[PDB]
């Protein structure tokens, strides 16, 4: 789901020239906007504690 969201975001940013908004992404995916936000909040890799 995250990978397909990234692919659709890439295609939409290519199409319109700016970053897609959550509502437009939800419309294109035929999925609820709340689910889109939930997916967008979990795509983070933990940051290292040794980073300067």
């Amino acid at each position: 789901t995250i990978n397909k969201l990234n692919r659709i975001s890439r295609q939409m940013l290519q199409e319109m020239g700016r970053e897609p908004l959550p509502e437009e992404l939800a419309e294109r995916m035929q999925m609820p906007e709340d689910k889109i936000r939930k997916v967008l909040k979990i795509a983070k890799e933990p940051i290292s504690m040794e980073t300067p």
């Binding site: 890439r10 290519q14 199409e15 020239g17 970053e19 908004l21 967008l40």
Partner: protein, 1328 residues
Amino acid sequence: YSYTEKKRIRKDFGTRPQVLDIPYLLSIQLDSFEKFIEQDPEGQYGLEAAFRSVFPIQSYNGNSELQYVSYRLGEPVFDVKECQIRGVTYSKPLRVKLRLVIFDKDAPAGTVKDIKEQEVYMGEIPLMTENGTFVINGTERVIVSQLHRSPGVFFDSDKGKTHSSGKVLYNARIIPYRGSWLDFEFDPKDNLYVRIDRRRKLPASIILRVLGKTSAEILDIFFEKVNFEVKDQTLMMELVPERLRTFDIEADGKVYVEKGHIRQLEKDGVNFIEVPVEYIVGKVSAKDYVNEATGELIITANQEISLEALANLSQAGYKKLEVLFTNDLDHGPFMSETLRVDSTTDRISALVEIYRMMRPGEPPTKEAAESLFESLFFSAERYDLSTVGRMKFNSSIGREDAEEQGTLDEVDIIEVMKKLISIRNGKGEVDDIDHLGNRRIRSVGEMAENQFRVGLVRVERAVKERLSLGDLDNVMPQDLINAKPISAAVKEFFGSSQLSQFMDQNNPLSEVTHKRRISALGPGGLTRERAGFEVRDVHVTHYGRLCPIETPEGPNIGLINSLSAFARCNEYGFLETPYRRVVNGVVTDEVDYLSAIEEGQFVIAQANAKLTEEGGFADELVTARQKGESGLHPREHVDYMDVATNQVVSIAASLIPFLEHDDANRALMGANMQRQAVPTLRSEKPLVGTGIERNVAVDSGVTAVAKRGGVIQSVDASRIVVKVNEEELIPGEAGIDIYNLTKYTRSNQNTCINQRPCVMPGEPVARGDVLADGPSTDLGELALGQNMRIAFMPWNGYNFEDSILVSERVVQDDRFTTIHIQELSCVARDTKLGAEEITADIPNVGEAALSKLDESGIVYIGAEVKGGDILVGKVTPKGETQLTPEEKLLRAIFGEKASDVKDTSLRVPNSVAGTVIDVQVFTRDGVEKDKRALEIEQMQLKEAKKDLTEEFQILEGGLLARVRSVLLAGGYTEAKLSSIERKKWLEQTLENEELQNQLEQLAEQYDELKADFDKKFEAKRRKITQGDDLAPGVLKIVKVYLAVKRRIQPGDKMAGRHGNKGVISKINPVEDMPYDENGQPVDIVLNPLGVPSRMNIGQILEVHLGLAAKGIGDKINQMIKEQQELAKLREFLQKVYDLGDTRQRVDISELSDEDVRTLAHNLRAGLPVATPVFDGAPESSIKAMLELADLPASGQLTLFDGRTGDAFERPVTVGYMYMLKLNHLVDDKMHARSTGSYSLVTQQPLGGKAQFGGQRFGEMEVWALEAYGAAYTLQEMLTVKSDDVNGRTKMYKNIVDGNHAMEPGMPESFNVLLKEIRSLGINIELED
């Protein structure tokens, strides 16, 4: 004189006229970024070069390719101000036209079957503002230029510090912009050895064999051949005369010396000679000899010749034998020796050995080895000796061809090897690595281009991969390009690069110095620890290019430099400095910009050289420099002259008066701390200056400079409207210029940025005139500090060391009070338990703390808040919390139980008191806006409506005035025009076609004057109304801006411009200050003991000059107060401006009466004086100035002690010095902690004032405590103060209950160490 400078003319004490004005200070950034962005038809600079370097992208099979057409930059979504407010990067979209030609498989390759053209979005490129800054993530950043090693070939040596003996070992290094490094070095055994990419070393003949060179060819290239035939049954050497100049010489008619000059006998000239057989025994062969009958190789190339070999050649019938030349001084057998040690015999074996060196532990194949070599150096995809690198390479080896090639080749490598051999032999010299002709300046444009090319290669691999596959029937080229890698590359460069630095915004000088900074660090540069003495030193080539004074004092000494005043970067990136041509013995005003390599040849005199009326030199033997060495040279031998006296010093060093009387060590500090000054409430000009302040103030961009001349129509504290002159109007323009001023805006260092108007309604202004003075600016002059009365005496130890004693009046008049704007943020997010809400219903908080909050829960604008006051009230849902039995009993007794939400609200930091001046509310799209959000939205919409209406009203007034004038071309009574109501003009009726067509188009244009302005206002409504793109999980952000007035107090750091810094020790009363005979007390008393030891005398001179300046001002004030005639004032002003033999001719005859009165009014607080660096005011001029002001010529007055009234036994130097308030305030440095937060792993107190952390008791402190014998104090610090979790709690309880005793335990750090060592599979255990 310009209008802004005619208001206050600064007296110039210089004597040398200037032939070249100081150029724009921010050219190094603006020119580079213009090179990056502006389209290049030749395709050599900027984005075009990267596009043509990456494109066209060809598929592996050949089915299709993607090629470049053109690029363009779109319109920005937001301007600079909205980008800063919102917190987004100021950038422009990049749109590239790409076409995807499809080839035909059936047709022969190269047939264009189809063409598909589309514009592709390739990311957003950040934009440089007009002042040379970038707005990244809402903050202002500066990209520092880099001083890096220039690409090419450098010849160097170990200086005999590696081998046991001296044995100076020579190496040559070929370093490209991109690709592998090639190293050719010598060994202690005199063998040429080769390294690639700094790995294991091989004989240099391998690189020669891999190019298809036979050993005979190598010997022919690298050696000279001497021939030996057999003539008339005798040995026959072909004699070369230059060689001869241990045996008996032939040519009996001209016998030379036998076994014991040359030219005299060589004069006749013979071509024959006979040598003994032994002369051949020691030589080595040159070519391979083959016998057809035997079919074998009698002697090989590069073999020792023996008697048996000579006999075999004799029997073979061969008569001609050639051998290589070998000496011990001029020619060496190095190549023969490295051929001997080398085991390679063919190209294939050389490739195999190179492959083993490159890729060890891998089976070697011919195709693999061949590929590796071709790619390492002869591939344009992996090797690039750029234009600068190629130019340096060709200059190094003296090659006059292949100027456009960026790949090494046969000729290049062999020329490098030959030149290294020659350098070893003695012909030639090594290169200087610190020489500025070998170091290059790399600016924003080049770095941005490189990162864009990295992104383009990332997208080019995927584009190639997709092109390989053949389903391109319904595929458009915008479906092949992914702009995310390119955007990632540029964003990484502009936000995470070491050279993309947070802007220094204390004052305009800090801005200018940061924009003109060069760093030897950064990617592709040095490191702080690995840098040596040599690179940190001042080179003779730094004259006029790098400032030898301005550099950080510390680990970064010598690694961060500042551009000189007149320094410039040429097209190749090398620093160049201007010079005046000397033609026919006279100094012509023509300026030639010379680089170090061009500077070395010529002899350049200095600006201090005396000149005659005819333009020639006065004294026969002038001082000059040649090849970096100073000396005395004849007048006729001088080729160039310096253009200015401040050519070698940077701007900050050029702003220090009397710099020539100060040491370099203290001038360094003066220049450094001139960038740390904090602007005050009232900007005051320096009484003693250098004349460069105007340049810095104008070029920094903090001031509002008029774009077009005219008459100021309207002035207000936040807006200036200027009526443009009739000669500077674009046809069909409004005719007005609007300047909106920045009012109380936070800077990067939490200072105040404020622009104050300096013009009145009706004042004429020209182009370049200053309309509003920014921070630290006074009437267009840089004003970093204040002029303070200074007495150089000790005062009861309150100026001990570097301490400063300051009078109370300084505090009373707020001379050093500063406004600091601080930004605080409250982020309400979404949690698992619920969503954080901003509201005024804060549990466990009384109505006293809710007084300053509104219904929405946000503090009012203008509310005076102290530490602990609630600014934004936020409540977060909290989970079930377990209660102790006593808490349960308390809740049962008093039924108060309201813990549904927890108070985590934004509170003012402790010891911070200020006024809320701005509140910004950001709400996510789809979240209900609270009442405060709609209030701010309505205020913004009203502001936009009013601003647009007013701007349109003024511009339409100007344009209708133009209309009026077009009618006045004939001239009539517009009273009849006003007889009909203004709107009713559109209700008129005309029947004549001539009049009616006019009316038609006029109506069609008036109604169209509404559509465009409505479009502009609708765009503004879109910008304010729309939601904000916040981080995931963030619901609402409330930002509160606090303005804090910080007054001077003990502990604050105050300093001058001569490196004399100090800390204020006491705020003494006015009655305790020393006072003169007139009763005027001094405001600051400084210790004299700090002048002689640090040898900064320029302050004392400044002090004297300041006194004289103020004295003259006082006289002017008296003349104004006594209402004397204007003739006497004019006479006095002319007398003041005619002192000394100066280059300045300020005559007052053409100054009007009002101009004279304005000038006198601006000279009330003292006459400004300019003393240029190295061209300053002599002591005689200062004494004459003092005598004009009726002051002692020694600058010393008789002072009286305010506490006793007794005159001091000696006169005291009393004057006026320009003092600054540095950004080191005791308010931000005082910290204290008893107990607070602790580290997660080590269970130790955190570090820093922001985290309420504790001080570090390091190893040295432990050593000191052990030396004292203080065991118990050390145990206290180690255990019960840092990491004994039970011990520190027990200590706190014991202190609360009076028993000052401790029960030390085991530090948690030792337990962590134990667990770590056990995790390393090692049993560590505490025996009992």
